[PDB]
Ligand binder design. Sequence first.
Ligand code: ADP
Ligand code: ADP
Ligand code: ADP
Ligand code: MG
Ligand code: MG
Lengths: 524, 524, 87, 87
Amino acid sequence: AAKDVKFGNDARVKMLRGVNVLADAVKVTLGPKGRNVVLDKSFGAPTITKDGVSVAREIELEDKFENMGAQMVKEVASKANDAAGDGTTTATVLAQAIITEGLKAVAAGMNPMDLKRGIDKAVTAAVEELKALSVPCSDSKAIAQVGTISANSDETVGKLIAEAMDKVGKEGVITVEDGTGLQDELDVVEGMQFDRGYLSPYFINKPETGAVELESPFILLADKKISNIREMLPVLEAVAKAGKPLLIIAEDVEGEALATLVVNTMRGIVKVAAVKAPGFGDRRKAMLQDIATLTGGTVISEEIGMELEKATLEDLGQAKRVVINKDTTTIIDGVGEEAAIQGRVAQIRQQIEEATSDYDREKLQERVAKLAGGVAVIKVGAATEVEMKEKKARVEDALHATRAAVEEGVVAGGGVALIRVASKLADLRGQNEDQNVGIKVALRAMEAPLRQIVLNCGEEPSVVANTVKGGDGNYGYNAATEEYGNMIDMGILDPTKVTRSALQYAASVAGLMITTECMVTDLP
Amino acid sequence: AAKDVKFGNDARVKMLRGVNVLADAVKVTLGPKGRNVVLDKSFGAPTITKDGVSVAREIELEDKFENMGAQMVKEVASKANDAAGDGTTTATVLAQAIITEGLKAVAAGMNPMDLKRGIDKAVTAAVEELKALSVPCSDSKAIAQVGTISANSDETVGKLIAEAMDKVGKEGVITVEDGTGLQDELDVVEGMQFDRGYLSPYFINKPETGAVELESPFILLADKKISNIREMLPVLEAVAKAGKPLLIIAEDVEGEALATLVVNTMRGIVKVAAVKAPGFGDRRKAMLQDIATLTGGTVISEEIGMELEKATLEDLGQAKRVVINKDTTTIIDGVGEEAAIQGRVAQIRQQIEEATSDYDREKLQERVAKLAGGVAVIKVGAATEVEMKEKKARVEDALHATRAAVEEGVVAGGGVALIRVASKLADLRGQNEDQNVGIKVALRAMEAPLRQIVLNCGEEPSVVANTVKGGDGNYGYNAATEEYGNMIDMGILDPTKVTRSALQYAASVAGLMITTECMVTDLP
Amino acid sequence: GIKVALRAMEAPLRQIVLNCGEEPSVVANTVKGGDGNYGYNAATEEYGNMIDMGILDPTKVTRSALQYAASVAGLMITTECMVTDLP
Amino acid sequence: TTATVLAQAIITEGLKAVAAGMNPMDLKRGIDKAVTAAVEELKALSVPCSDSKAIAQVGTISANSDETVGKLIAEAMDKVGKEGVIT
Ligand SMILES: Nc1ncnc2c1ncn2[C@@H]1O[C@H](COP(=O)(O)OP(=O)(O)O)[C@@H](O)[C@H]1O
Ligand SMILES: Nc1ncnc2c1ncn2[C@@H]1O[C@H](COP(=O)(O)OP(=O)(O)O)[C@@H](O)[C@H]1O
Ligand SMILES: Nc1ncnc2c1ncn2[C@H]1O[C@H](COP(=O)(O)OP(=O)(O)O)[C@@H](O)[C@H]1O
Ligand SMILES: [Mg+2]
Ligand SMILES: [Mg+2]
């Protein structure tokens, strides 16, 4: 294909125009005051959205070069959401400010490489300062309002989340279930979870979040990389007698064909899934038979001693519910029985004494807590099930935030945290002035999220930013109530996890943007 | 896809042009004098319509941005019809007036957010005042002319509706049936209804209102979310022996495939339907076996104790007629027999004493009245059945209005009600003047429906609006007879239900329109 | 109308501060909060008594600027129609 | 330059008020009422200048802060006297 080659300022000017168009649309929707963006939908009334992610995914530009600049910022903003579940608009507000000023400095003939180093040095220092700024919210009492604040300042969703982590503070998995009673129901089931993606991108089922809630499927568990269609078809034939969905847990399938192919064949037919087992080698294999002991299943392949093909519905695990997604496999409640599952407890307690490897010891002491801790199951018993269905997303909204908050503590929400780092590290100086200019570009960019939010509020951003900069600690503007106060006390706070991720991702995209010598795109 | 990005006044000016084009066409058809709009039809003479809904659905604009502005007003006008069955043109007359003036205020640099708050504050106050304005029409004597007025001022259709609600005043379901006698026939059959939509949008049958009148089908009733094509095909084979249509009542089907698919497969073949059971959990399940007791059927699935597949035509409910639509399931007369149906009456009377939950008590006392109240069946015995078929739509016309009227009472029809709220709340003032301007924009907009109607009448709107504003209570212009009088006495009135819905929906679309910072549409 | 004139009178200070690069509104608030000749020395980017710092403007020039601006501006706001040669 | 900046602000604020539906002529009368009062207050604020130190300072500020220009004009101011003309 013919490729259009662009160079120097020619390419950079095109890239900035694309960054600006995407940032402008995402920036208006920052904070409680974010103005709605009308997104054309192909049939039906155009969607009106106050959410940055929907607008960003929508934005595509017709200029090949301008689109490439927009796409690069979008992927880093999405990466911020992957690390912590929000920060998508904040990442683009920060990225646009660093990128626009940095590109202008490069257009002044300044060395791009140390401009990049100076911005990165300031970012690393700011990240350490943010951790110092952090308020540990480990205690359940802190979790109680942290969770209420986390759920878009809603007490009802927050308290249920807080009630369960009252159950497990930290690592206990908590899941959201539609309530079967009009009173809310919470129980802890000693099920399981592991952070392993599904073996095709296309396994998505009914919940609009790329995920696979699955009611009473049976589970295959395999100890060699499975020979595919010839011996999986017997099992699929057996599975299709009963009518239940199947999940493959394995090393992989012999996957170049059928791990790609099976989800394109089987969605409309039967619904069948596949996932990687956790860790590698003996740990993966041992962990698969740990998984087996907990589900009630046994592990199966031609290779070791326990042939696959003629397997029945008894020769499987089963779980009352399963969740599976791009990045996670979750077992909500096995068919396995208390005594058999506790065939494990004697060994796992024993090996913790003595294991000759430090990470084997760590894995064993992680595994026993995990195995016994289980999954906290929250049933949202709202009077209206459509409304608990609606609040169900906010509850998933909340635990993403609450989990991030417990992991890194909390910072003064509002860009007050970035203002105090900016004021805190004004002293930091670059070795050369290209480096010095880079430090300043990063510091000025840190002010941009607070200023954009006050602009959406209609307050002129400068008076407020001057007052917030002048103020002490968590003194900040609550734009929803339009007055200054202590933000943490007022109830505006976010995890140090979220702010740190947005700043780091914004810095990386900006550095690449400043140092991009040439852009090659397909000819229009 | 390449997306055209618009910003600030650039987008708003495009959106206003689209709102204006749609509003202009809908506004001319307001009231008895509404001038006809010729709607091109692809083959045959162009339809001439004095109905706003037909014109609004028709209007589509070629500019991507202009169409998006029109579509947003259309969906809110349709939402007004969904809440109460009319108000579609009135919503657009009100929406255009708030949107045009509000956009002009935003174009004056005024803060969009409080303009929005000021309009909304005035609307909330006006809604309370409208309820104070309300005349309770609960009494059957009030229903008698309320119904006559409701049926486009026709006494014949109104009296039959009034005669049946003489039967049940309020909650008793009343249905319209083609008369089998030349004398009108009215009977009350203790059948059933529940406000649950059908499980595909495409289930539509013979009546031109998206609905499913169905003569003697048999009914499936299921107590688990059904395993689909493999065990539904036996039943479908059994059903297709007899030749009757089938309805699935269930939690759902295992629906991602066959609940979407079945209506695309089975329309031309056999005609088969599916609906959600009412409520959730024990209440849904109990209510399904309440439904079972009343129809004469029993509830069926693999899961609890009563396998599906080999079921006969006896192992079903049956009803003489059924109605099903986007939002409702109706059972007109079971096959069930008096004594068996009254297997229920002892329990339902008993549990009302003692139930330990307040909403369980409410559901029980709602359920007994509902179960015994039944469906009032009106047979329109006109001398001409084509004419009773024609009047049949007006009778459906009437009960939509009569039901709304009994629920909220009635207000001086004619925009006289909105004039008196506007005059009543002239005192209301915004905290800031952006808020003050918003209150005034809402108040001036309230006058627009009366003025548009007098303009269609050919009276200049100002003299009449000045006189109506000056006059007392229900003093208003009867544009059909072209003279002022007491509107309620003259026979021009509408439910508080209808006016309140139109004002609320118009305010919501206007606020979004004023605060829309950016519009993203697919490139032309 | 009186308010429009008073708000406009703050405009020269804001524009000098904008040319300096400091935030005009923040400086305007400090000067408005201050009293007497307290003002922002644009060259030294500091706040001090203007007479003491030597920043003095002739009264005739300031008075003339206000009167001339008000007369032309007041007529311009009243314009409702413009008639000009077709391009 | 200051007259243009003041005029631009009065027109921008006035046009926004006319857009709100405020009668344009009434705003013009209000602007004029404020200006007449402001001119009197400038006369009260004014303190006379004839010190050659002050004469140099008004010259320096008027010359984009050129100290030499103000210094020389004060001396020429001094030598010619009030009836004198400086070119
Ligand atoms: N009531 C408020 N007062 C001040 N700012 C707020 C308030 N609530 C949230 N914020 C801040 O505004 C941002 C939330 O805006 P949001 O629309 O969710 O964009 P994003 O997805 O990038 O976080 C966060 O930075 C949050 O800290
Ligand atoms: N005889 C009449 N006198 C005055 N106005 C009337 C008369 N009859 C109805 N109206 C008013 O005119 C409106 C009915 O117009 P219509 O064409 O049905 O549009 P819409 O569907 O929005 O109600 C209602 O607001 C009604 O109150
Ligand atoms: N350091 C200073 N502080 C503030 N303003 C200054 C300073 N020095 C000179 N000025 C000038 O700024 C304005 C001068 O305007 P100028 O640009 O010289 O053109 P003109 O006098 O025709 O309006 C005056 O307010 C004057 O005070
Ligand atoms: Mg957010
Ligand atoms: Mg109508």
